[PDB]
Write a protein that binds this ligand. Structure first.
Ligand SMILES: NC(=O)C1=CN([C@@H]2O[C@H](COP(=O)(O)OP(=O)(O)OC[C@H]3O[C@@H](n4cnc5c(N)ncnc54)[C@H](O)[C@@H]3O)[C@@H](O)[C@H]2O)C=CC1
Lengths: 421, 398
């Protein structure tokens, strides 16, 4: 009988706030009949990673019969500067690493759908750049086609969000960046945008530690030369180097900036009392659960996502869940959508909307021109954007706990703890 | 079995189009879900509209012909919903016209009883107003009329009977029928006798047709006027060829037509019982009866079929056949001489549809009725048993 389903659809509709709206019907269909206006940009995402027991299907069955090897338009972000479509590729993250040619093919199919619904630029979110030669494998295949929207890794806007987060975690921590020992764990695409931008827009730190794998020794040595001769960093520069896990010199840092794609390299239980942690990674370079545990028990650290932006005006999100997956889902999973901060938007996805509104913000393929992120940073300030409030995945750091941290590990107070004697 | 001309696709045609796996179409045709049957679905009528159809148009077929591509799009409505709420019917149609435009359709046919429920297109043209971003609509009734005349030609040919010595009875002279009668008198030998049958409300309308027959159409045979209260009057059963084009079903009793009668019926649903016509044919081979609006292409058509997945869980056409109404939209997109039709029209240009179909070597579909094809051997037996000289020598079961 059909009474439970019509009431369940009444619950999500009568709970649609002014800024979060579920829609049970296909966004693609609604767009084609004229009930959904076109978008100015889009962002591509994947279905995370497959649990054998989150879903009752096999991984191969999901790809073939649930996703049907087709991109799925799942969200719309309505902002004061345009509309962004969120399009899920019919793949998990491990599928994109094991077959790059297939990943490129399904991306191009999604680029064509993105053009139909109006997108002029398309962001590659998450680990998609890492698996597609940072966009280069896609650009080679699009060749001389001009019918498709232009791609972007968005990492210049992501780098701006990380520096905005560095600015915000220091303020809320009651600390000054010029007296921090900043450690960078992994200098990859985003890290190559954060480090130059940080030195141009924020006060220079007292000390900088560059940490990456052994293979990049001379690469870090030349980045060290960039610091002293291009950006004029006059402080101390240490070169940390690790295999599998961070070296024990990174725990001497008071601000840790993570930009690796390898998870759990940083032991959250070994950072000293008072450490600030900004990490743009999915998954994060530390155990989030142990970090929430340590923060709740001791109010010992400040830690946050680095790639999230906060809009000065709220954003209306329209959400269409995959119907066959919506049934297997529970009420607690749906609450995560309704309880999302309507001011927040990821820097990566937002970058595509920025390119469609400002022609001076050119799309990025490959890793290059870290300095250009300054233009992203300045425009985000002109629009009164800041970093997202301190949070990590599902967990928001309560203001009172942040206050307790600020009262005990602020400036002039860090030096009076045991591990800083 | 499995032919290369009928292919089932489990994935959404709309999605496949947006990722570039399906080329755009040149035209489209709008249909509906027949009539709600509680013995087929366990869902209630309103639940199907709200949660199975989701009040959205459904792109369900592609027909690839040698003269273009046609998309078949189902409105999220049953037939009686179109009559009971014309405003809502226009709104869903405009939504379908928007979808049809995205996938490239330049012209869109209104199939079935959609014209009869939308002022023959004028209820839609009013709502589209000055919008020029949408594909142009057509009732396609000039092409349907051409199909009916081609069927009249074929049924008399395969029956071994000459139309000039036939007594032709017209049941239902609405939009389609008014294209058939004049076109028949231009393309085929004039019959010996013509009977015009419609309801009492159209008495003077039929009387007006008689005067045009003798003064404009040049008909010199006998003209009889019959009125139908509910079922057809008993004087149409004196006709040897019956042409039907009504919007009400089972008005003609198939069991009362005389041995040797020819029946061409464009009505959908048919104005007679399909199951009894088949039963009478298999036991007696007494009649020829066929669809009237079905065209046969000289070259085969490749049909892609995407069934609505929720309905498919509960869920063999001739690859040369395509309905004249749907094909009319494709004709408008390839020959700007054939313009779309909205409202009841003069049907002067009806002959051009007939001539252009003949140049393309089109004819009517082989004699069939929905799922049932009349075997060629049985048609041969009919041809030998029911010539004009032999009709009086059969026992008419009274
Ligand atoms: N499937 C398709 O693609 C198409 C189907 N058709 C079918 O052709 C038929 C006629 O369609 P239209 O001409 O557009 O509709 P219409 O409503 O203009 O024609 C119906 C006519 O039949 C007459 N009629 C009603 N009850 C009668 C009775 N008991 N005895 C005699 N006459 C009676 C009416 O007065 C009217 O003139 C319908 O069944 C329709 O579904 C027509 C065109 C395309």
């Amino acid at each position: 009988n059909e009474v439970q389903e019509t009431l369940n659809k009444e619950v999500v509709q009568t709970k649609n706030s002014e800024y979060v709206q579920f829609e049970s019907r296909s966004l693609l269909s609604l767009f084609t009949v004229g009930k959904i206006p076109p978008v100015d940009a889009a962002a591509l995402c994947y279905w995370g990673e497959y649990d054998p027991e989150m879903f009752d299907w096999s991984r191969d069955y999901m790809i073939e019969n649930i996703f049907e090897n087709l991109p799925f338009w799942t969200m719309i972000k309505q902002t004061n500067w345009g509309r962004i479509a969120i399009i899920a590729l019919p793949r998990f993250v491990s599928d994109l690493y094991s077959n790059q040619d297939d990943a490129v093919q399904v991306i191009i199919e999604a680029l064509e759908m993105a053009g139909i619904i109006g997108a002029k630029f398309v962001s590659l979110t998450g680990l998609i750049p890492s698996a597609t030669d940072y966009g280069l494998a896609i650009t080679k295949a699009v060749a001389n086609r001009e019918d498709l929207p232009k791609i972007t890794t968005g990492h210049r806007t992501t780098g701006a969000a990380v520096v905005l987060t560095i600015k915000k975690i220091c303020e809320q921590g009651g600390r000054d960046l010029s007296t921090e020992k900043v450690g960078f764990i992994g200098l990859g695409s985003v890290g190559m945008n954060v480090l130059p931008l940080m030195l141009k827009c924020l006060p220079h730190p007292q000390e900088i530690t560059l940490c990456d794998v052994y293979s990049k020794l001379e690469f870090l040595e030349n980045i060290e030369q960039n610091l002293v001769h291009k950006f004029g960093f006059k402080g101390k520069i240490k070169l940390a180097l690790s295999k599998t896990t961070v070296p024990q010199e990174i725990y001497d840092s008071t601000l840790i900036v993570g930009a690796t794609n390898v998870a759990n390299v940083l032991d959250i239980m070994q950072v000293k009392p008072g450490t600030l942690i900004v990490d743009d990674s999915g998954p994060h370079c530390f155990s989030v659960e142990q970090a929430i545990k340590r923060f709740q028990e001791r109010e010992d650290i400040l830690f946050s996502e680095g790639g999230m932006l906060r809009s000065p005006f709220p954003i209306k999100t329209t959400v269409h869940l995959l119907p066959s997956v919506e049934k297997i889902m529970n009420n607690a999973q749906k609450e995560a959508v309704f309880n999302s901060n309507p001011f927040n938007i990821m820097g990566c996805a937002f970058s595509a909307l920025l390119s469609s509104q400002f022609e001076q913000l050119e799309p990025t393929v490959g890793i290059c021109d870290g300095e250009q992120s300054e233009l992203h940073y300045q425009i985000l300030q002109e629009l009164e954007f800041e970093a997202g409030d301190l949070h990590c995945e599902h967990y928001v750091l309560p203001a009172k706990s942040i206050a307790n941290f600020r009262q005990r590990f602020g400036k002039d107070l860090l030096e009076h703890h045991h591990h800083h004697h």
